[PDB]
Design a protein around this ligand. Structure first.
Ligand code: ANP
Length: 524
């Protein structure tokens, strides 16, 4: 049995079901493909005896193409519709023309259709009754989408009496181009609507709460936070890491080459990725001498295991306390218990100095001080605040929890680790788990870099009472990007709301004037 549509899905689909050329603008994750399934089904059922609709669906990316092809065939083939998909994988050895003739829904990469319009294989877009453009914000410049639309519009603004298909675009963002004001952003959006001959921009307006149970992005308030003026722990550990890398790179010339790779600085997620890469290269490594293959790989796995621990401790020192970074290392080296004994005593030779720098009060992490300031402010204003604190890595979770537990100035916090009484839960990225922030009053992104964090809100408390989100970062770059993106999104949303308020004749005339201008340019 078939999925029940969400209400906001019906809401988005409705204008297209009424036959209007529509741009559906809805967030990543809310299931626009399913909305397009609803539109296509309704569309095809419109036709009376004898008549048959014919839908073309354009995919912009190969992986997405394959997925859509599968979704559409799975859903419609069962109902006895002819469904086909074709891309460059097969286009040069089949008759696109006959595939279009034989099918009710065709999933295509667009260049294929462009090629077959240009050689007359498909003499006219009139053969389609509905065209769906995924990622439709791409209908610009000289993209294949725009090239298809040029023909559609030449036909529309010309003297032919042959009908044109309905056009529906899907996108997560109509975008704003280089607009800085609502005036310019509205112009940009009207030009995209002109490009796709759209008369409606459909967004979720009536069923927002239901949407937000599926995908939700809160407003972020960014705050610049201090960071270390020096890191002696990091200098020492970095030296251990260089020694270790020398040892590792020399195991095998062939695998040695992997250490040539640059843009993998100590104490970063890039370094961790590089390590994953090394383990990967090892997994498929082969020599004729199998015992030696085994020796090389065992060696590399040992060395890299250590490097990974070091890299993690560096990150811990970066965002949290040196002592907890050091404990992380001590725990590892104890737990592992001979290259191993050597590496172990190489670490042990630094222990006294490491302990020294870690115990030095002047090595308190100033970033933690700013985190403290934020926490103290918010709990001072609202003592019953519940908080979710996101950090960069799994090891940082334990380090932050320890910091809170040992800090008498944070006596108001009872920390716990997010599972998937406590007033603050600590977590790192773990997709594709959606976090429900309808619980908490405060979300803190603490120097958070990595995979985006998928959030939902299972209920609303009013916008004033919905959870706050702070982005704490030491990067001026990140703060500037956040600010710019916030402006873009504001002007885009206000522009859309305005356009949605417009009289249909006003909108139609505005769009038509744009289309006339663009065609006049192209024709010359
Ligand atoms: N009404 C629904 N009931 C149950 N599952 C749904 C419904 N709508 C969508 N889904 C599922 O949610 C998943 C969405 O995956 P996704 O890659 O995001 O799809 P998409 O529609 O192509 N792109 P997007 O709009 O960004 O979500 C799919 O597995 C859908 O089947």
């Amino acid at each position: 049995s078939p999925l029940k549509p969400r209400n906001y899905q019906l809401e988005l689909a409705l204008p297209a079901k009424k036959g209007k050329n529509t741009i559906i603008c809805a967030p990543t994750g809310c299931g626009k493909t399913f909305v397009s399934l609803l539109i296509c089904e309704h569309h095809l059922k419109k036709f009376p005896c004898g008549q048959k609709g014919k839908v073309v669906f354009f995919a912009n990316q190969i992986p997405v193409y394959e997925q859509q092809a599968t979704v559409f065939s799975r859903y419609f083939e069962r109902l006895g519709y002819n469904i086909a998909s074709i891309s460059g994988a097969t286009s040069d050895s089949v008759s696109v023309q006959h595939i279009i003739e034989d099918n009710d829904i065709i999933i295509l990469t667009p260049q294929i259709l462009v090629n077959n319009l240009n050689n007359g294989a498909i003499p006219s877009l009139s053969v389609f009754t509905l065209m769906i453009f995924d990622e439709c914000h791409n209908t610009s410049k000289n993209h294949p989408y725009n090239q298809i639309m040029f023909r559609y519009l030449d036909h529309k603004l010309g003297e032919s009496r042959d009908p044109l298909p309905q056009v529906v675009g899907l996108t997560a963002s109509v975008g704003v181009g280089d607009a800085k004001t609502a005036e310019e952003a509205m112009q940009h959006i009207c030009k995209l609507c002109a490009a796709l001959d759209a008369s409606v921009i459909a967004t979720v307006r009536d069923n927002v709460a239901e949407l937000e149970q599926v995908v939700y992005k809160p407003q972020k308030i960014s705050r610049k936070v201090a960071s270390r003026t020096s890191n002696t722990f990091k200098c020492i550990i970095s030296q251990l890491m260089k020694e270790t890398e020398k040892l590792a790179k020399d195991v095998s010339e062939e695998l040695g080459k992997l250490f040539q790779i640059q843009n993998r600085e100590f104490g970063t997620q890039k370094y961790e990725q590089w390590i994953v890469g090394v383990h990967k290269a090892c997994s498929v490594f082969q020599m004729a001498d199998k015992e030696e293959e085994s020796r090389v790989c065992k060696a590399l796995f040992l060395y890299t295991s250590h490097l990974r621990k070091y890299n993690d401790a560096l990150i811990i020192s970066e965002d949290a306390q040196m002592t907890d970074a050091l404990n992380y290392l001590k725990a590892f080296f104890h737990d592992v218990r001979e290259t191993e004994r050597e590496l172990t005593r190489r670490f042990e030779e630094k222990l006294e100095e490491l302990e020294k720098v870690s115990r030095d009060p002047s090595n308190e992490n100033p970033k933690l001080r700013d985190l403290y300031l934020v926490l103290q402010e918010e709990y001072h204003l609202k003592p019953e605040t519940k908080t979710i604190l996101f950090v960069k890595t799994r090891a940082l979770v334990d380090a932050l929890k320890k910091w809170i537990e040992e800090n008498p100035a944070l006596s108001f916090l009872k920390p716990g680790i997010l599972t998937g009484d406590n007033n603050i839960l600590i977590a790192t990225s773990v997709a594709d788990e959606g976090i429900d922030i309808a619980e908490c009053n405060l979300v803190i992104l603490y120097e958070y870099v990595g995979n985006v964090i998928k959030m939902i809100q299972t209920r609303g408390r009013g916008r004033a009472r919905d959870s706050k989100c702070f982005l704490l970062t030491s990067s001026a770059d990140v703060i500037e990007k956040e600010k710019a993106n916030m402006i873009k999104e504001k002007i885009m949303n206000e522009s859309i709301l305005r356009l949605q308020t417009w009289d249909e004749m006003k909108f139609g005339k505005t769009v038509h004037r744009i289309q006339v201008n663009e065609k006049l340019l192209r024709d010359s």
